[PDB]
Amino acid sequence: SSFSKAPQQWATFARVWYLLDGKMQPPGKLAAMASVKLQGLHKPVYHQLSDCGDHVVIMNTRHIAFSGNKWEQKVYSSHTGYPGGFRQVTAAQLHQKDPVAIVKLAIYGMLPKNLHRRTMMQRLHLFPDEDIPEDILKNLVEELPQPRKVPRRLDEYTQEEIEAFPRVWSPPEDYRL
Template sequence: MSAIRRVQQWATFGRMWYLYDAKWQNPFDSADKIKEYISGTHKPIYHPLNDCGDHVVVINSRHIALPGMEWERRVYFHHTGYPGGASWTLAWELHRKDPTLVVRKAVYSKLDKNLLRRGKMARLHIFADDEVPNSILENLSGQIRQLRAVPKRLDHYTDEEIKSFPRIFDWPKDYVIPN
């Protein structure tokens, strides 16, 4: 076996580090994509009993977007184990307490329910903003593509872009567009 072929084979078994930007992404759709990389199903050597997954670094979890009324309707259940220890927390309350928990719980629920799940979750690194420690940035080797494009805010458009935007009808010459 040549040296190049051997290095390619070693890279297949090595754990890669991927970056995923969760800004304006649905965390439950993103969890499907993140699950592929954490469990290793995107690799040609995947086997259900083999733990060959990669590390995934999720940034901007503070800026996730839930569809419709999900912030008010989605409820997370927790029980302490003691009588009367049941509690229900709405998604917006949980997100306000810790911005990484909604994404973490979404990925955790998507993973297979077996003994490998906690080990796979240890390879998920979630950050509320885009500030990542240098020790993690040094390891990054790839990026996972976002599922939907991040929309541009209206106040981020320049005046030239607003004026050059196509209009359905033409304004009269003496009309002044209010700001």
């Protein structure tokens, strides 16, 4: 690139901020791509000893969509240490109290279990809604695509689509709906 030695090294090991929307996206699929960016497993210059790592900003974390009945079946448990201090909280209850706890715990368990996990979690920014400080917004570079295609409801289909889809059956005229 004919760069000088100093600016060439700075450009290669630059930090990049990413934006990742969370509107109706499962936290597991949200954490899978977020874990890669935090570690730096997307840079061909990756190495665990090096401090390569990218900030990730996740917005709309109150609107995550757990698949199946995991809102009532999955539980998050912790112990305060004192006797009789074992607390088990359902996924729905935890999300009702701390909006970003579901996503943060999902990522916190997927990163490597070394001592760098504490360091690389500090680069993760979570926001319940689209209320981001202007300082954070000016740092962003690009937005990652949503991992799950959000299905559209019946009222979101245009009248052209409704007429295009064939009518499968012919109901009788004398039936009362």
